[PDB]
């Protein structure tokens, strides 16, 4: 049986705390409550509880049925080097990760586990961790000589790795049964596929393992270049033959991934010129795809990650500047602070991009992320909209963030900072409030105030009540209601807007775009 791991989990014990990844709850006196709280304050994870859960626990395999009956040829699958960087990790979570890899990964495929101590200061992480792992076949420890950060610590591990495939995990995870084979099987058929497990949540307080039971969410971004999840689009569903095939992901949705070692080297690994820590995966994502390149999530590979109890805008700007061509303006327009960031010397990245003969960001949007609406931002038809009548006041939409279409459109003092005063007038005659998501200005049926609704998807009908005529006189006309957009003052003298019978005179109805 070539599936056998180097070490076998002891038999599952349904009485043991957290067995199978079920939630754990301790009955604690007040002293013990205080110990629990203090470790949470220090680690942002319930280490008190982790310490009372086995380092070897089972996780119930709730994958789609087809996953569980897949057969692998273990003689021809590539090997891997699993790479785990850490900094001041609690003992029980770090070790549970190590044992999980050892106990769920077939020995014929697991060449090594390489742990990278990124200048930890905890004394238990010094010579005792070396002693503990000296008994664990194939586990290697490297220590950095300065504080490197996740990316560079990973790269240091990668330089030591000699497996066919680099598999990057992190230092508080637990692997599901059969997590590894699907990543290596896919890479064995296409060495340019960067393949990620589905990352399941392990609850930081209860240690419950929340397994995604069906189709996973996949990775994209919004035009602020903030990571956002999205559901798998129809095109990609129809491309795939089986619902357990890999799923193309426009961007990476976590830090866990497997890549051919040689291919990672060929792409230049991570962007070393970054200096700042965080957000490096957007740059990696664009480079993988543009330089030919697949980034996929594998529904049969599941790894749980302990998301702890709760900015890198320079690295986001760096990704935009290297990869996005003309489309970076749509980003800057909607995240103006990004214009100020020191993204750094990108000369060598521009050279890399040419050596690799990478394709354009236009290609990327059309072929990798066609479900993303791309704004036009036509010259003179985007920015803040200023009143003539109350000429200190700009159109301003300000919702409560627990439902973006909760407010009504209004006025507020022009700031030139975008955000709630950024608007786009569209070739399809929509007034879009699309700094964050694609929201479209509407006049509801028979009302006189102006709301927002989700814009139509590309190619779909433009509803009558979100059509706007923006005449060359500052008149913003709304055909469905027949009324015009007018600045006014409420009872209390607060500037505001309303739909009133059209009056080319009444200056509160004349308006102007600004950049």
Curated annotation (Swiss-Prot):
UniProt-annotated binding residues for substrate: 118, 147, 277
Molecular function GO labels: carbohydrate binding; manganese ion binding; polypeptide N-acetylgalactosaminyltransferase activity
SMART domains for this protein: RICIN (SM00458)
Superkingdom, taxonomy of origin: Eukaryota
Chain ranges on the Lumenal side, renumbered to this chain: 1-515
Catalysis: reaction(s): L-seryl-[protein] + UDP-N-acetyl-alpha-D-galactosamine = a 3-O-[N-acetyl-alpha-D-galactosaminyl]-L-seryl-[protein] + UDP + H(+); L-threonyl-[protein] + UDP-N-acetyl-alpha-D-galactosamine = a 3-O-[N-acetyl-alpha-D-galactosaminyl]-L-threonyl-[protein] + UDP + H(+)
Example of a GO cellular component annotation carried by this entry: extracellular exosome
Pfam family, one: Glycos_transf_2
Protein name: Polypeptide N-acetylgalactosaminyltransferase 4
Native source organism of the sequence: Homo sapiens
């Amino acid at each position: 049986d070539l599936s056998r791991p180097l070490y076998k989990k002891p038999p599952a014990d349904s009485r043991a705390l957290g067995e199978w990844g079920k939630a754990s709850k301790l009955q604690l006196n007040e002293d013990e409550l205080k110990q629990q709280e203090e470790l949470i304050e220090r680690y942002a994870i319930n280490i008190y509880l982790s310490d009372r859960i086995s380092l070897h626990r089972h996780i119930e395999d709730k994958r789609m049925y087809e996953c569980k009956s897949q057969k692998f040829n273990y003689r021809t699958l590539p090997t891997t080097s699993v790479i785990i960087a850490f900094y001041n990790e609690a003992w029980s979570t770090l070790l549970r990760t190590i044992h999980s890899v050892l106990e769920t990964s077939p020995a014929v495929l697991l060449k090594e586990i390489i742990l990278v101590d990124d200048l930890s200061d905890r004394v238990y992480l010094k010579t005792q961790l070396e002693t503990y792992i000296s008994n664990l076949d194939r586990v290697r420890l490297i220590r950095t000589n300065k504080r490197e950060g996740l990316v560079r610590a990973r790269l240091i591990g990668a330089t030591f790795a000699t497996g066919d495939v680099l598999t990057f995990l992190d230092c508080h995870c637990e692997c599901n049964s059969g997590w590894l084979e699907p990543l290596l099987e896919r890479i064995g058929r296409d060495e340019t596929a960067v393949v990620c497990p589905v990352i399941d949540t392990i609850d930081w307080n209860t240690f419950e393992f929340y397994m995604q039971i069906g189709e996973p969410m996949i990775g994209g971004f919004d035009w602020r270049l903030t990571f956002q999840w999205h559901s798998v689009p129809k095109q990609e569903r129809d491309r795939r033959i089986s619902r357990i095939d890999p799923i193309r992901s426009p961007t990476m949705a976590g830090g866990l991934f497997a890549v051919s070692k040689k291919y990672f080297q060929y792409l230049g690994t991570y962007d070393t010129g970054m200096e700042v820590w965080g957000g490096e995966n957007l740059e990696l994502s664009f480079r993988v795809w543009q330089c030919g390149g697949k980034l996929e999530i594998h529904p049969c590979s599941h790894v749980g990650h302990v998301f702890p109890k709760r900015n890198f805008l320079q690295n986001t700007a760096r990704a935009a500047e290297v990869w996005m061509d003309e489309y970076k303006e749509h980003f800057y327009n909607r995240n103006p602070p990004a214009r100020k960031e020191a993204y750094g010397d990108i000369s060598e990245r521009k050279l890399l991009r040419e050596r690799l003969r990478c394709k354009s960001f236009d290609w990327y949007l059309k072929n990798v992320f066609p479900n993303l609406h791309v704004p036009e931002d036509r010259p003179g038809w985007h920015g803040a909209i200023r009143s003539r009548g109350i000429s200190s006041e700009c159109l301003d939409y300000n919702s409560p963030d627990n439902n973006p279409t909760g407010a009504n459109l209004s006025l507020f003092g022009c700031h030139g900072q975008g955000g709630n005063q950024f608007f786009e007038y569209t070739s399809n005659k929509e007034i879009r409030f699309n700094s964050v998501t694609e929201l479209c200005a509407e006049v509801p049926e028979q009302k006189n105030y102006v709301g927002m609704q989700n814009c139509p998807k590309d190619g779909f009908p433009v509803p009558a009540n979100i059509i706007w005529h923006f005449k060359e006189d500052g008149t913003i006309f709304h055909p469905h209601s027949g009324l015009c957009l007018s600045a006014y003052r409420t009872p209390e003298g607060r500037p505001d807007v309303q739909m009133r019978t059209c009056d080319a005179l009444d200056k509160n109805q004349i308006w102007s775009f600004e950049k």
